[PDB]
């Protein structure tokens, strides 16, 4: 179906704020990661996929396959540890996180040229839009 492949420059981030503070990521942390701005880099075959959140902060690494269960170690964003599963939703990426917060996981897709992000956790929802640089 759809490769994800890129390299992705953010152009959109709508309530990140909130969506750290549901997490509970203290003041200080929450103040610089908003003014970040990380790149998606993103290297898929088939169904195993690496998907890098880079920035000049922190990076956060997800190596996984679709479908297959694991235990994901958030460190860096709010340290948590989660059982967490990506599974394909037709061409959409659909992502849950179990663990301590309700209804934590993302929703990733492709329109067009734009890769599309969806974070949430307890019913907040944070907005990514990105583009690859043509
Ligand atoms: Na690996």
Same mark, same amino acid.
């Given at each position: ?9 953010? %152009?959109?981030?709508?309530?990140? $704020?909130?969506? +750290?503070? *549901? +997490? &509970?990521?203290?003041? *200080?942390?929450?103040?610089? *990661?908003? %003014? ?8 898929? &075959?088939? &169904?195993? !996929? ?11 690494? !997800? &190596? ?28 959409? %990426? ?7 917060? $309700? ?14 992000? $969806? !974070? ?15």
């Amino acid at each position: 179906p759809v490769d994800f492949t890129g390299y992705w420059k953010m %152009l959109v981030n709508e309530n990140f $704020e909130e969506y +750290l503070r *549901a +997490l &509970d990521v203290n003041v *200080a942390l929450r103040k610089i *990661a908003n %003014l970040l701005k990380p790149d998606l880099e993103i290297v898929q &075959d088939g &169904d195993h !996929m690496i998907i890098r959140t880079l920035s000049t902060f922190r990076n956060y690494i !997800m &190596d996984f396959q679709v479908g297959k269960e694991f235990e994901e170690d958030l460190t860096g964003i709010d340290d948590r540890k989660c059982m967490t599963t990506v599974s394909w939703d037709g061409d959409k %990426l659909q992502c849950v996180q179990k663990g301590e917060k $309700e209804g934590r996981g993302w929703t990733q897709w492709i329109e067009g040229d734009e890769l599309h992000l $969806e !974070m949430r956790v307890e019913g907040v929802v944070c907005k990514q839009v990105f583009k690859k640089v043509q």
